[PDB]
Amino acid sequence: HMPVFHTRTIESILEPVAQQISHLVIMHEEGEVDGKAIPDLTAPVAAVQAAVSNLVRVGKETVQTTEDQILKRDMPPAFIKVENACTKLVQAAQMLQSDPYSVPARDYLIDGSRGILSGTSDLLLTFDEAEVRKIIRVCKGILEYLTVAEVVETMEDLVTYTKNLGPGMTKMAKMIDERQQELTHQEHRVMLVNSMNTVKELLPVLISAMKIFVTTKNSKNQGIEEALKNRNFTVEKMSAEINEIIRVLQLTSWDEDAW
Amino acid sequence: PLLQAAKGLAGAVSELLRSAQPASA
Numbered sequence: 001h002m003p004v005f006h007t008r009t010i011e012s013i014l015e016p017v018a019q020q021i022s023h024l025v026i027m028h029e030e031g032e033v034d035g036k037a038i039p040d041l042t043a044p045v046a047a048v049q050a051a052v053s054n055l056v057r058v059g060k061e062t063v064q065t066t067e068d069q070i071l072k073r074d075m076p077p078a079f080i081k082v083e084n085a086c087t088k089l090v091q092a093a094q095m096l097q098s099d100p101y102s103v104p105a106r107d108y109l110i111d112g113s114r115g116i117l118s119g120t121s122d123l124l125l126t127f128d129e130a131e132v133r134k135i136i137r138v139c140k141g142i143l144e145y146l147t148v149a150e151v152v153e154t155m156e157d158l159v160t161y162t163k164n165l166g167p168g169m170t171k172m173a174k175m176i177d178e179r180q181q182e183l184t185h186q187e188h189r190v191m192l193v194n195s196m197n198t199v200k201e202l203l204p205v206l207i208s209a210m211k212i213f214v215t216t217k218n219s220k221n222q223g224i225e226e227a228l229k230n231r232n233f234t235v236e237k238m239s240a241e242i243n244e245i246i247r248v249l250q251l252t253s254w255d256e257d258a259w
Numbered sequence: 260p261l262l263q264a265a266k267g268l269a270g271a272v273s274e275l276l277r278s279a280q281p282a283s284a
Contacts, residue, residue: 009262017269020276027280036281044275051264051271058264082268089275109279116272120265127261 002114003121006255007182010124014117021113028106037100038109041093052086052116059123071130074258078123085115125256128182132253135175136246142168143242146235149206155214162207169203172196176245183252191248199241206234 002018005011028034056079063075092108099105145165152161176196180189213227 013262013266013269017273017276020273024276024279027284033281033284036284038279039282041275041279044271044278048268048271048275051268055261055264055268058261062261113272113276116268120268123261124265 003118005121006125006184006253007128008184009182010121010128011184013124014121017113017117021110021117025110035101038096038106039100040097041109042097045089045093048089048116049086052082055120055123056083062127066130068130068133070133070259071126074126074129074256075123077258078119078126081122082116082119085112085119088112088115122256122258126258129253129255132179132249135172135179136249138168138172138175139242139246139249142172143239143246146206146239146242149210149231149235152210153214153217155211155218158207158210158214161210165203169200173200179249179252188248188252192245195241195245195248199238199245202234202238202241206231206238209234 003014005014005018059075059079063072066072088108089112092105092112095102095105095108142165145168148161152158173196176192180192183189183192209227209231213224213231216224216227
């Protein structure tokens with residue numbers, strides 16, 4: 001029933017509130033505590049309404065500013081969730097201001113607080129899925145560009161190829177590095193990291209195979225097909241490493257049912 | 260930004276739960 005926090009960022013933001021809810025429940029099992037009046041919660045609830053309203057606007061701005069259709073589809077249901085839970089909190093504060101000892105008002109308080117927790121988790125998760133999709137798009141870009149190696153036959157096209165690829169790789173590596181730090185499972189971290197390391201080591205090897213090929217074509221020594229094949233093998237081993245990374249990232253997410 | 264907005268909501272809910280504790284206990 002209680003939501004699962006998948007990344008370290010999400011855990012840091014939500015875990016403490018989840019703990020606070022449990023503390024309140026446990027506190028209420030003690031005889032000295034249950035029976036006591038819940039103080040006036042009008043103002044503290046007004047603060048929550050204000051923060052919910054801010055979160056919904058920021059989310060709506062995030063929905064109207066993105067190309068991510070999956071995001072545009074998933075966020076709204078989460079807005080409905082937190083708003084509904086917020087409504088319960090507002091109701092409970094009303095009930096508790098006339099009857100500070102209501103047991104059903106206290107239940108509304110806990111249910112509203114739990115609902116906000118899970119609605120916020122869902123929202124943070126959706127936003128996290130989308131960030132991961134951005135990383136996957138970059139990897140997929142690099143994967144596509146790796147096949148451009150097949151149309152490179154001149155030394156000039158090679159220099160262009162190298163100019164364009166190097167920075168794409170550097171950017172992929174940074175994103176993977178950032179991502180590995182969000183993960184809660186070491187299994188995935190080392191997979192991602194070792195794969196990225198292998199692709200980085202293969203780059204100069206690919207660029208060298210492409211050069212040998214161009215040179216051979218020019219100089220004409222007859223060994224052109226060996227050169228092509230070797231270049232293709234390199235592209236092939238790099239492409240498999242990247243596909244592995246894409247797959248681990250997809251495994252590291254897709255998490256919620258939504259989309 | 261979204262992350263800061265969620266931190267603010269988590270903050271408001273924590274303060275609310277803390278205020279719900281009896282005066283005093």
